[PDB]
Design a protein around this ligand. Structure first.
Ligand code: MG
Ligand code: MG
Ligand code: MG
Ligand code: MG
Ligand code: MG
Ligand code: MG
Ligand code: MG
Ligand code: MG
Ligand code: MG
Ligand code: MG
Ligand code: MG
Ligand code: MG
Ligand code: MG
Ligand code: MG
Ligand code: MG
Ligand code: MG
Ligand code: MG
Ligand code: MG
Ligand code: MG
Ligand code: MG
Ligand code: MG
Ligand code: MG
Ligand code: MG
Ligand code: MG
Ligand code: MG
Ligand code: MG
Ligand code: MG
Ligand code: MG
Ligand code: MG
Ligand code: MG
Ligand code: MG
Ligand code: MG
Ligand code: MG
Ligand code: MG
Ligand code: MG
Ligand code: MG
Ligand code: MG
Ligand code: MG
Ligand code: MG
Ligand code: MG
Ligand code: MG
Ligand code: MG
Ligand code: MG
Ligand code: MG
Ligand code: MG
Ligand code: MG
Ligand code: MG
Ligand code: MG
Ligand code: MG
Ligand code: MG
Ligand code: MG
Ligand code: MG
Lengths: 48, 82, 60
RNA sequence: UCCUAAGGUAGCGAAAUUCCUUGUCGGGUAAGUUCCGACCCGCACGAAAGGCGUAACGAUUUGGGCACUGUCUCAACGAGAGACUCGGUGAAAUCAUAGUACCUGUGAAGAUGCAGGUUACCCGCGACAGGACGGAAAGACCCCGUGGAGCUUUACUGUAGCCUGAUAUUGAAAUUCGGCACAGCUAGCUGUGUUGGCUUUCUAACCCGCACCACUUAUCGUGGUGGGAGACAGUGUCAAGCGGGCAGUUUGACUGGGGCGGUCGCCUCCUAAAAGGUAACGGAGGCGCUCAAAGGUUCCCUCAGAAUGGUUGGAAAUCAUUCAUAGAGUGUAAAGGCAUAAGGGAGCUUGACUGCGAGACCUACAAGUCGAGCAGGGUCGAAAGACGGACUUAGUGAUCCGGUGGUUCCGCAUG
RNA sequence: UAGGCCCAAGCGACUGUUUAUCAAAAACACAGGUCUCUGCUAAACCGUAAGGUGAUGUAUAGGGGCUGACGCCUGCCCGGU
RNA sequence: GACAAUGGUAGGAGAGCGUUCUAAGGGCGUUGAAGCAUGAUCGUAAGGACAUGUGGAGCGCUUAGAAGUGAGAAUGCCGGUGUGAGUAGCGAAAGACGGGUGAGAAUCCCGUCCACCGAUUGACUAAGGUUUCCAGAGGAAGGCUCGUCCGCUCUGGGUUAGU
RNA sequence: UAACUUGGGAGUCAGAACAUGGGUGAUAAGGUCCGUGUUCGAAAGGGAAACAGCCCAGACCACCAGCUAAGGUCCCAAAAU
RNA sequence: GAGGGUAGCGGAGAAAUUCCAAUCGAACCUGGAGAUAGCUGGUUCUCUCCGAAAUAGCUUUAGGGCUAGCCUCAAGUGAUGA
RNA sequence: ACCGAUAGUGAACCAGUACCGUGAGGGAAAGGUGAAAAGCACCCCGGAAGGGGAGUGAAAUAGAACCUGAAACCGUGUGCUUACAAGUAGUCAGAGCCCGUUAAUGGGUGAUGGCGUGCCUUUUGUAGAAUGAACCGGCGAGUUACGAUUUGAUGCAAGGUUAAGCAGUAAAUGUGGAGCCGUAGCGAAAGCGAGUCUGAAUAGGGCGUUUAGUAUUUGGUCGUAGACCCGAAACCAGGUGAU
RNA sequence: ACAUAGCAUAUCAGAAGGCACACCCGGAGAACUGAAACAUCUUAGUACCCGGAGGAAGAGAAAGAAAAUUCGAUUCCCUUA
């Protein structure tokens, strides 16, 4: 509150809107796979 | 306890910063501002180009020198060599 | 009671360390110089984040 | 002669109103700023916010006499209550500690405390009032607070009430005056159907603080009977205008204290002390735009004046000749610049472009200007190059919200 | 123990009432004057309504302004609200 | 052994004593605990001890926790005691003497004399107040003095209605 | 012997007198307003008779030790009649 | 003199801002309620180290605030400071 | 790890009582003999109250105002000192006379000289004639919960971590992996990815990449709550009052 | 006039009032304050007032949530945040 002078968040303008469906993929990098073996599968039941 | 007269003017302009902004000898870079004026008090020389009636600014790298070449005129050059 | 952010932070995006405003003086007059209309990109906020870093805390 | 809706009549008038003012003149006293009578030169009397006069009346206001007196020049003495002395009983406001002198001076600018002098042995009772900025009330005067109250108004926004329409309760009948849908004829009329209104006319709703009868012996009330009004009112619902009657509220700051006058942002000098910066109610001026060419390019030319003569004569509206360094000109106010022109003409044209930008200067921030070079498309030029507005510095206004033109973007099961 | 008196002005006519506890007056009332509203469930108020005042009254009577006995008198303007 | 540094407000940064309670360990206490008073002692400060009196029953010391934790000012709050001070004031006014009571008398009781209101300081009724009414007894406190006395204390009593 | 970058914690936005360059005022102020230095504020001592702002100089504590600064040397009062 | 009525946005007023339980430009008593206060006063034990400002910009702002400036611990960079 | 009589409820005590108000409503003070009443038989002065002996009791210096008894303050004889003196009351020198210690470069008194204007708040500045305090006791002002960010600590390591509940000396330990944060960002978004975004561009830019985060807690500070205490006129509800 | 209001007897115990009004459910409902002023907003549907019950009242047996594969009355606790 700058004392009557309007604050910093009145001069700057607003822009954007978020979404209603902003599907957030759990971003697993490729480096993390260098720990296991047999090469069978990677799986949303196993990679958890 | 008598009503004194009204003043008339007050009313100054703000300011502008003028004069030299770099000095003779040091090492400048190809966008920097050498000197600036509301007119032409210092002409440009080699490797220094004018702006819009102001802001003599160095084209390329080097060190600066002040110099006269007439009886009154003065100019600024930059030599990249070292 | 939990710290209540105030929603003037629809106007700033946390970059990874610093804020990010959107540059002011957008609409309502363009009788204004042409290379200055070209300045329409955004800058990070200055070091007056001292005066506001208890207001925008949960945008993270 | 000019203007207004008209321009103050009667009667009073230096008055409870007369600033200049103790207006000038006459009574009263030897002496008269107040009083009494008249004058008009009414700053700024005046006809029901009343004018002018009036016998009686007032604890009224003002001036002048008589009777009378310690009110006074000028005080004196008597009587009583307290004060005073002794026996009885015995509070209060106040209070940093105190064995507490005066002068001149210094000091937060008026000293019991400090420097320098001077004068005073310790202790109490009776008085007086110059100090102790003595006590008594967190000064009422003044000024501040984005402090409250009460009052006012053609401040803003509202509201109790009051007036007028629509539609419900709410029914029948007629007269008309319409627009609209069709026919037929001479833009206009007949029938012809929707279809609003407009006047009336009834009668079952409703109302009658409207008389009679019963509950009952009772002015309320309920019920019937007869009357009068009548589809109006009264009532709800929605809509306009009225509305200080009543409520919450706002009414800026700067200021050699405050209201009054003037100011409030940008641009240019000076003050400003040879970098930049640098105030005051210090001194001087401007702006809230203008220009399709007064912008870009390629060429070429040099001025206002001073002389000297020459149809017209401005002293000076054209013409030549000569000496002219800028003494002219630059759309605009000033400073800094310009004769390589950045001034003046002549030919073409739109770079008064799109996407940008290394790096600087200024700066609390938001802003603010200057940018070499990079790509796409050009204009001018033979080419080298120049051009991303006018010789610079003024000519403008965050956000929010809304409008219009695009949009490869989201569009709450899917489209 | 029981009234000082007279002459002469200004504002009020008078008797009366008022700021308990600093103001008794030239203020307020008053009889009279006048304008305007009100036809009877009157307007005007109090109440949200029912009820009541007005009034068990009926324009020679009610509520509301402005002046303040009596005397002589109340001149001009309807542009504006 | 050197070598330098050490005035200080607003304010920033460290190291510290003491008070109350709990946990654990370890003690002192009728051969006298905590507080209270007095003393020439010890630590750089806040503070720590030790003898001697008074006191009659519950305290320290080390470690570590948790906080209602420290007093000189708020015209602070409450309770005490002073200064002013033996100072102002005793709340209108005519009393004097004799006798008696009494441990004590200008003040209480009896007498004479004197003065004071007398359209009232007189005699009655309602309004209020609620034992103040009367007798006997008492003297701490109340009465602006005194007291043997009282409208105050103690004990025991007192108000009668057909009109 | 400092400087700068980052991150926690503030306090100040009522200054004053001297010495000089200036505006305002009247070449008036212990006036007001800027520049620039010092000291006080936040600094005790010694001198200026006493005296926040002038002149010397910066107090960690002890001692009955010596030199010196500003001002002084007949007496009050240390030191040259 | 005795009974009675009118109650706070209200009542009464021969109008003065007078009266309404020693008062009143809107009574008192509770409760919202520890209202708010940019304003005064007050804030308690000790010692070491370092130690400022009274300015700039903008404000219904001038005795208030926010940022920069000036101090302080903690890390770094480390020759940039005089 | 709540108070121990100015605390704790206002109220330990024949408390919503005395007491103030017409009323609605305000609203106090005041605990302690000893183990047991053994509560002072008797003698004496005095009218009594009180008092000195005797007596009970470990103690009456424990006498029903009763344990302990501090300060202000009012008093009693005393060792030194004061009637020619100018004073924020001291301090530093130092004579004389009196007393002998937690035995140490000893304690009290002070004829006379230097030196010197109390304290706190507030200030450009104060002895200030600016404010505040009569004095002595007692009480009386940065606290807590929930969060956010920071350094200091301690577990684990590309991983860290439990909430509610359910069992259990109101045991702080067992289970519970719903969730949160972090390992990857960029853009308004679709979407893209070690890089995207604007953009015609592989040009130039802004923000990233190369790895340390996490859970609890001791500090410093913010936010919401009354949030360092004490103070206003004033507003709005609901009532009691015309004596 | 037919009956109804009305009127007269006999039975019945249904109600009224009070409550700790702590907690709950409906009716009606302010302002101080924050925004650095203030009117929309917020203090808050909070305090006061009134009505009705209970040992607990209200809600409640889908005209629901959801979008995948669906599971399923209401209430309450933790996260979503
Ligand atoms: Mg005369
Ligand atoms: Mg005359
Ligand atoms: Mg007339
Ligand atoms: Mg008239
Ligand atoms: Mg009279
Ligand atoms: Mg006397
Ligand atoms: Mg006497
Ligand atoms: Mg002087
Ligand atoms: Mg003097
Ligand atoms: Mg005397
Ligand atoms: Mg006297
Ligand atoms: Mg005052
Ligand atoms: Mg009828
Ligand atoms: Mg109003
Ligand atoms: Mg002002
Ligand atoms: Mg002035
Ligand atoms: Mg300069
Ligand atoms: Mg869809
Ligand atoms: Mg849909
Ligand atoms: Mg009269
Ligand atoms: Mg009149
Ligand atoms: Mg008249
Ligand atoms: Mg007309
Ligand atoms: Mg220090
Ligand atoms: Mg600290
Ligand atoms: Mg103890
Ligand atoms: Mg005290
Ligand atoms: Mg006092
Ligand atoms: Mg006397
Ligand atoms: Mg006798
Ligand atoms: Mg009686
Ligand atoms: Mg007596
Ligand atoms: Mg008796
Ligand atoms: Mg001067
Ligand atoms: Mg200066
Ligand atoms: Mg200094
Ligand atoms: Mg001296
Ligand atoms: Mg001397
Ligand atoms: Mg008045
Ligand atoms: Mg009256
Ligand atoms: Mg309060
Ligand atoms: Mg509140
Ligand atoms: Mg230092
Ligand atoms: Mg005690
Ligand atoms: Mg009692
Ligand atoms: Mg014995
Ligand atoms: Mg004693
Ligand atoms: Mg003297
Ligand atoms: Mg200060
Ligand atoms: Mg004094
Ligand atoms: Mg005082
Ligand atoms: Mg009466």
């Amino acid at each position: 509150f700058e004392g009557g002078q309007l604050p910093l968040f009145r001069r700057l303008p607003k822009r954007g809107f978020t979404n209603i469906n902003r599907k957030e993929y759990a971003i697993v990098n490729l480096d993390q796979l260098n720990k296991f073996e047999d090469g069978t599968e990677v799986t949303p039941a196993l990679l958890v | 306890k008598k009503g004194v007269s009204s003043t008339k003017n007050g009313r100054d302009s703000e300011s502008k910063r003028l004069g030299a902004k770099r000095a003779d000898g040091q090492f400048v870079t190809g966008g920097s501002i050498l000197y600036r004026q509301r007119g032409t008090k210092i002409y440009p020389g080699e490797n220094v180009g004018r702006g819009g009636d102001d802001t003599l600014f160095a084209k390329i790298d080097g060190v600066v020198k002040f110099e006269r070449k007439g009886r009154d005129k003065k100019q600024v050059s930059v030599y990249a060599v070292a | 009671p939990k710290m209540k952010t105030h929603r003037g932070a629809a106007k700033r995006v946390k970059r990874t360390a610093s804020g990010q405003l959107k540059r002011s003086r957008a609409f309502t007059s363009h009788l204004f110089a042409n290379k200055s209309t070209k300045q329409k990109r955004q800058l990070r906020k200055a070091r007056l984040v001292s005066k506001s870093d208890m207001k925008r805390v949960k945008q993270l």
